[PDB]
Amino acid sequence: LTILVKKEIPRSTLDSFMQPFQSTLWLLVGLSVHVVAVMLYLLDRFSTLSSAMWFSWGVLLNSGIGEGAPRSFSARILGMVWAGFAMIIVASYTANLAAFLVLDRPEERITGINDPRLRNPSDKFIYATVKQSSV
Amino acid sequence: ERVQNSNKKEWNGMMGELLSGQADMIVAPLTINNERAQYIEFSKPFKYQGLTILVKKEIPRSTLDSFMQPFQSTLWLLVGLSVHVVAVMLYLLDRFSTLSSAMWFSWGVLLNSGIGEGAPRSFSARILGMVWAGFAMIIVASYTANLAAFLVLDRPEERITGINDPRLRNPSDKFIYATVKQSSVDIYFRRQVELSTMYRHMEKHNYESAAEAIQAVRDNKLHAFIWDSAVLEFEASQKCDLVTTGELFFRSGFGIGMRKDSPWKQQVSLSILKSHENGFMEDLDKTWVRYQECDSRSNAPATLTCENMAGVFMLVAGGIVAGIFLIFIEIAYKSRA
Amino acid sequence: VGSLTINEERSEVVDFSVPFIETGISVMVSRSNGTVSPSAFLEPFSACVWVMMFVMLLIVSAVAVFVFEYVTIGKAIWLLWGLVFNNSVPVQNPKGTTSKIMVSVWAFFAVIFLASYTANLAAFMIQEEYVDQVSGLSDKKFQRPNDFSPPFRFGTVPNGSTERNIRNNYAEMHAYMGKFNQRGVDDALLSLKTGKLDAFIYDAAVLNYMAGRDEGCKLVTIGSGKVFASTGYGIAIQKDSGWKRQVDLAILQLFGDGEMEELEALWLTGICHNEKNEVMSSQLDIDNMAGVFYMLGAAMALSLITFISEHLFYWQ
Amino acid sequence: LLWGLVFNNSVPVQNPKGTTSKIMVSVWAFFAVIFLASYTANLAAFMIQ
């Protein structure tokens, strides 16, 4: 003897889909790319302006675009800590993919014949046990 | 104990003394039983606890130790030689339509390195280089995949299922239980005919000191000790490498017992309530209980020591003096060539 | 026989029995959670090995000095930084390099170390024992409710002994619940479901029972269900009754057999007891990078310090 | 070059002179970084299951 129930709806696939997580901190950290570009430009201003924006985009995107290290080594130090920042960005990206593809599902099963949803039945539970049967 | 001299059921130990009036009362983890209440006055239960089994903590599986290295006992140097193979066949593709550098360049495109060379002039060699790049990417994807293979999802399930385990219901030689002498659980198991499934084993391995039952688990002789949770969880949380089952085997409490007809109980039990009202019980907990000197049960398993990665750095140090000797050999080769 | 809290205010009037059920008072709240672990998630990656990288920054550079005996030392340090990292920028091309072999000796440590690092970050994402309850009622959520900017307003039974105990213990939280008190516990459950009530204080026995009986059990008690006030359930007895001793002996008989587990199994089951788990966290807005931004702006201060120190070095 | 842009490239490549296609690399928005990470994430899923 067994109980047949309906199969649960699957949770997620390529659907109305879990996008990149950045409803917040998306364009704001984009503007900080412009900020770190112009402050390093200021570090080169008193001791390569628009390209420095796109180069800072490339070092966000791990791209080889045009420019190199500035002549002030502190600007290169800030570029290295920016590179660590972009690497922890992509590490957190892989981490949030790992957040939502596994480990979770709605536990919506019965426990067996000793379930009090059948032992103390409510209106939200209907059982058939068809007529003239041995059960 | 029923004394065999003239059939005398006398309460053994100190309970017989306060039965004979050697003391007026007793403070203790006082187990409450039916046979005690027929002779002894009891107050309200001062403590609330339960029966639990203490066992030894399982050894942790892996950290930075004698460590899971790169998986390539096989296919390590052989695919290294195929780097030489794909280098020389592309060299042959450039031979009839950049030899030693092509080896090192093929090493770099294995290691995602920007070394020197570019694409060959034959586009089929560049096509083979692209499929080699897909090969190296599925190599590193499988590398991340095998890290994901062994750091999570698995642990040896070596726990009890509760009081209905047939390793205690049908006990074998590989399971030892203490159930220390002159304890209430002994009368409880004598009352259960279902615990006649061996109670005699429990009599054969009865102990005297509870600390000896602790030590024999630490000496791995005793497999399990049954005791109240109020002692077991506290000593497990203060002295590590010992864990409980967590399952409450029997609901119980600790009152205070006096002899019959001492009228102070009406103010005594209320004082137990009164010490409950200001949270003076919680003052006792703050002065004794909350100092938990061990980690949690959560093994989170996500922890890392970073001491044993220096074995890779020793390979870097051997490569340093190997590069020094190769510098000497190249100096001699410049002397020749 | 109802469900009476054993207390001093009734023992003076009526006689009690031995408590068959240990019970107690706690707070039921509906919680919404996630995986919120701040920027110290890298505490498994202890920095004592990180400086072990940094001396490997230097020593091979010394070997580069002999490669310079065949552009400078201070230029190659960010090359070696990107060699630790996933580099993309154009770099030096050394001429007489046997250090190109030392890149194969480096054997990319980004490829080893970063992959193992994000693997352990995946491990910590698997295993983050996140909590959101506020245990320890001496926290300002029951002391200074207007110090936050929701006005915290709690409710309870008005004709209940528990609120009499509360007016007997703390000083004023009953008056803090004077804004609203719920008669009818299902109304309190629905009010907490609709976010009207902030927290509901009641006896944790029926709270645990209804929490296990609820379908989506985000409505849980504080912590592991550890109460703050604890008592038992007794029986009202006519005073100076001779039978009640025999009754209490019979209670010890009912504790002697172990049938009360079966009598609890009449109702204990069906519970989603089952609670140290992790739910997915979409778009979870953690703002731990603000701490990383604090490291960033601190470095911006350091850069300014280098700029002024270089300016005084232009004065020297 | 576009193969390595799909891939994790390391080799020296062209440097276009009048490139607005350098902006099209930002339009590419590295698809290695998106696609390969999602790919090895699902390989981790298959290694789990």
Swiss-Prot record, chain B:
Location of region: Pore-forming: 99-120
PTM field: NMDA is probably regulated by C-terminal phosphorylation of an isoform of NR1 by PKC. Its phosphorylated state is influenced by the formation of the NMDAR-PPP2CB complex and the NMDAR channel activity.
Extracellular side: 144-308
Positions of disulphide bridges: C240-C294
Subcellular location: Cell membrane; Postsynaptic cell membrane; Synaptic cell membrane; Postsynaptic density membrane
Domains as described in the record: A hydrophobic region that gives rise to the prediction of a transmembrane span does not cross the membrane, but is part of a discontinuously helical region that dips into the membrane and is probably part of the pore and of the selectivity filter.
Function: Component of N-methyl-D-aspartate (NMDA) receptors (NMDARs) that function as heterotetrameric, ligand-gated cation channels with high calcium permeability and voltage-dependent block by Mg(2+). NMDARs participate in synaptic plasticity for learning and memory formation by contributing to the long-term potentiation (LTP). Channel activation requires binding of the neurotransmitter L-glutamate to the GluN2 subunit, glycine or D-serine binding to the GluN1 subunit, plus membrane depolarization to eliminate channel inhibition by Mg(2+).
Assembly: Heterotetramer; the NMDAR subunits are modular and harbor tiered domains that function in concert to regulate opening and closing of the cation-selective ion channel pore. Forms heterotetrameric channels composed of two GluN1/zeta subunits (GRIN1), and two identical GluN2/epsilon subunits (GRIN2A, GRIN2B, GRIN2C or GRIN2D) or GluN3 subunits (GRIN3A or GRIN3B) (in vitro). Can also form heterotetrameric channels that contain at least two GluN1 subunits and at least two different GluN2 subunits (or a combination of one GluN2 and one GluN3 subunits) (in vitro).
Family: Belongs to the glutamate-gated ion channel (TC 1.A.10.1) family. NR1/GRIN1 subfamily.
Protein name as catalogued: Glutamate receptor ionotropic, NMDA 1
Organism: Rattus norvegicus
Highest classification ranks of the organism: Eukaryota, Metazoa, Chordata, Craniata, Vertebrata
Portion held of the full protein: 488 to 838 of 938
UniProtKB/Swiss-Prot annotation, chain D:
Region described as Pore-forming: spans on this chain: 1-16
Domain of life, source organism: Eukaryota
Non-traversing membrane segments, not crossing the membrane: 1-16
Cytoplasmic side: 17-23
Localization per Swiss-Prot or TrEMBL: Cell membrane; Postsynaptic cell membrane; Late endosome; Lysosome
Site (Functional determinant of NMDA receptors): N8
Entry PTM: Phosphorylated on tyrosine residues.
Tissue: Expressed in the hippocampus including the dentate gyrus (at protein level). Detected in adult olfactory bulb, brain cortex, hippocampus, striatum, thalamus, superior colliculus, with much lower levels in inferior colliculus, midbrain and cerebellum.
Transmembrane stretches, start-end: 24-39
Task performed by this protein: Component of N-methyl-D-aspartate (NMDA) receptors (NMDARs) that function as heterotetrameric, ligand-gated cation channels with high calcium permeability and voltage-dependent block by Mg(2+). Participates in synaptic plasticity for learning and memory formation by contributing to the long-term depression (LTD) of hippocampus membrane currents. Channel activation requires binding of the neurotransmitter L-glutamate to the GluN2 subunit, glycine or D-serine binding to the GluN1 subunit, plus membrane depolarization to eliminate channel inhibition by Mg(2+).
Family: Belongs to the glutamate-gated ion channel (TC 1.A.10.1) family. NR2B/GRIN2B subfamily.
Subunit structure and binding partners: Heterotetramer. Forms heterotetrameric channels composed of two GluN1/zeta subunits (GRIN1), and two identical GluN2/epsilon subunits (GRIN2A, GRIN2B, GRIN2C or GRIN2D) or GluN3 subunits (GRIN3A or GRIN3B) (in vitro). Can also form heterotetrameric channels that contain at least two GluN1 subunits and at least two different GluN2 subunits (or a combination of one GluN2 and one GluN3 subunits) (in vitro). In vivo, the subunit composition may depend on the expression levels of the different subunits. Found in a complex with GRIN1, GRIN3A and PPP2CB. Found in a complex with GRIN1 and GRIN3B.
Domain notes: The extracellular N-terminal domain (ATD/NTD) endows NMDARs with a unique capacity for allosteric modulation, harboring several binding sites for small molecule ligands that act as subunit-specific allosteric modulators of ion channel activity.
Designated name of the protein: Glutamate receptor ionotropic, NMDA 2B
Organismal lineage: Eukaryota, Metazoa, Chordata, Craniata, Vertebrata
